[PDB]
Amino acid sequence: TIPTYPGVYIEEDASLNLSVNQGNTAIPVFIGLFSPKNTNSQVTRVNSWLDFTNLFNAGCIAPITIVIVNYTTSSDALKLYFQNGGGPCYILPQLDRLTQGFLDSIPELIKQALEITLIVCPEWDSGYQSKIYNSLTSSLLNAGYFLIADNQDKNTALITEVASQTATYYPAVKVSQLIQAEDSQIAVSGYEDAKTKSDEVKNLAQLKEKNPTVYQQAVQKIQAIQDEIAANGNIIPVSAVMAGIYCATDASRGVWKAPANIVLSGISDVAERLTDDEQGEMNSKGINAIRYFSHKGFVVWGARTLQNDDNWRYIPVRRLFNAAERDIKQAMQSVVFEPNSQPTWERVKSAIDNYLYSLWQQGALAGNKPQEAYFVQIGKDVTMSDDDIKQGKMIVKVGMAAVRPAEFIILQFSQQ
């Protein structure tokens, strides 16, 4: 409302806002068909659900280009993300057609935002998701980024550029209702006639009062889409939910705790009911499953990555190393242009050793004493040679030991 007199105003509405959380080690970026309220392609930081609605148009209908329409699950996926404990996030809206120029620019756009740690594509279309996932180059993933992916099949695992930096989840989740937007909140562009320029029509409401013929053309497709989504149920990709669970787990228990055995909230049902034998096949292949247990509800029942080896098999082990090398890199950025001499190397060793000791205190690392948990090495004849120093190089070796989760518990019952 527009206040004129001092005092108390009363409004009746149905707008829903959610509690805002905070975090540092889990900041996801969402790539999808979003509808920003401002025309001006660039990553936008969103602090909460209220901020998102202030900067974006929430709804299940993508902006209309003149006509064609598209169905998007981005808004409801974000609602699930905030309902599950999500904090501030970045949004990368994809507008118009999916050109190769946009795909090539994705790794650079994400790197420009310096706080990104997670990548999520909250779109139901399988072909659209595959194109986005293939655009994440190995250089981007190896730079300390983690991709949460929605597996489209129960039998075949996803393929990405870096296996150890990816986790897949199956199946998608249903919700009770989608977010519906008014005509004024549906972006419309491309319309033009003899008496009007292309920029004079901005939303569906303006289109209705200027040309009812094409307005009826658009609403037919909207109604057709609404019928189709109602028949198959309101299915939402599960990667957006997992992004919120990552944030909640890190804030509560820490990065070294597996983001599994956590109850989902805000969902209505899973797209498919799984058995133990089926889950046994997916788990070996690296597909984490969303299971339903009567005494619990809907829970995450997998903590594996797409790479199956003794090093990077588990998500908490992989994510802990990403967090450690990110925090260590932040500490060494105060030493970049220091003189390359022995007193500089001593300060580097002290900074890393101080950080690693704090990590061991909280229980992130394994061992009964620090010497069993980590080590730091740097020297003139230990890690780097004279040629490296003459070239301006500084080499330091860091090793850590992590704790693996318990995945199988076996009960042995006896009669006597």
């Binding site: 394994a366 061992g367 009964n368 004493k369």
Partner: protein
Amino acid sequence: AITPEQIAVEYPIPTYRFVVSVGDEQIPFNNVSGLDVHYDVIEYKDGIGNYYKMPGQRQSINITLRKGVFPGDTKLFDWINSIQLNQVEKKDIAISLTNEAGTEILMTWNVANAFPTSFTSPSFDATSNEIAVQEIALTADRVTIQAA
């Protein structure tokens, strides 16, 4: 010459390193006390001078846990505020003396079916230099000790 493995086997244990589990969750606490077991005594005397003594009924267990006040944390108050008329969720409580690094358990005290009866808020004193400490009092059924 005394080896560290000898100390871990023969020497007594101090009190300051422990871990407390409330229900299926672990909460850091500052002070835990009251884990006592009591019995009554039943006596019988006769005219020719006999005197019999037997154990009686076991009494109920009372426990107090002390904890500091942290930002955004009201878990202990939420537990006592969930009482409706006579219904409340009862939780099992385990207090374990721990290795100096927390990776090994030495001895466990198991407390079954505990529910809160009292909650004490910190006293706000403008001349003090202390930390806000809350205390919760619990009533339980049984206490057992298991040696690791």
